[PDB]
Ligand binder design. Structure first.
Ligand SMILES: COc1ccc(CC(=O)Nc2cccc(Cl)c2)cc1
Length: 186
């Protein structure tokens, strides 16, 4: 099946807890995979305009590890619940992808999660201005704009709204698309 195939692919790139004990400032993100209309999608947030870091930017759910978290996956799930109402029974964490090093002292660990088909986002407006889906296949043929760094523009055909996706968030989306969608018979 589509979902068993995606999970099998993802597991081959799992690094597990290999880098998780290193003494960094630690953040986790959840890369949430949603199956709709027979295709996989990634779920993104738009950060609230009143957040201090990166207001109004497109971002995966996530945040800083705190002492309650059993592990880095727990960070991702706790933050996703706070931000978009995703409950732990609604997500299967499949793997941990390559972590992202930033600012010399920070390590961001991405987890891919399969999201239940009955999940509907309940975003906390203090943190999240918007939640939207992008088909995973978009990231194989994105609409690129050069700002010099590359920016993806995705227009939701449901409503004509265009979102800009860039940086780590864009990079991770492409990685997931490659992992899951490469070398597939039609
Ligand atoms: C630069 O390092 C990071 C990048 C992304 C994150 C994930 C994140 O913060 N997500 C979020 C999405 C909407 C609202 C809120 Cl409050 C948070 C954390 C660290």
């Amino acid at each position: 099946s589509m979902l068993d195939d995606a999970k099998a692919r993802l597991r081959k790139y799992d690094i597990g807890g290999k880098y998780s004990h290193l003494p960094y400032n630690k953040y986790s993100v959840l890369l949430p995979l949603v199956a709709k209309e027979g295709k996989l999608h990634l779920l993104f947030t738009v950060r609230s305009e009143k957040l201090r870091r990166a207001p109004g930017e497109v971002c995966f759910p996530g945040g800083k590890r705190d002492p309650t978290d059993m592990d880095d996956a727990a960070t991702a799930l706790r933050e996703a619940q706070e931000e978009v109402g995703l409950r732990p029974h609604q997500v299967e964490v499949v793997c941990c992808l390559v972590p992202c090093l930033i600012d010399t002292d920070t390590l961001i660990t991405p987890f891919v999660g399969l999201i239940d088909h009955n999940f509907q986002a309940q975003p906390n407006p203090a943190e999240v201005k918007d939640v939207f889906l992008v088909p995973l296949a978009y990231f194989l043929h994105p609409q690129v704009h050069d700002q010099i760094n590359h920016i993806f523009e995705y227009t939701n055909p449901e409503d004509g709204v265009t979102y800009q996706i860039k940086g780590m968030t864009a990079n991770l989306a492409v990685l997931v698309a490659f992992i899951i969608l490469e070398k597939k018979p039609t």
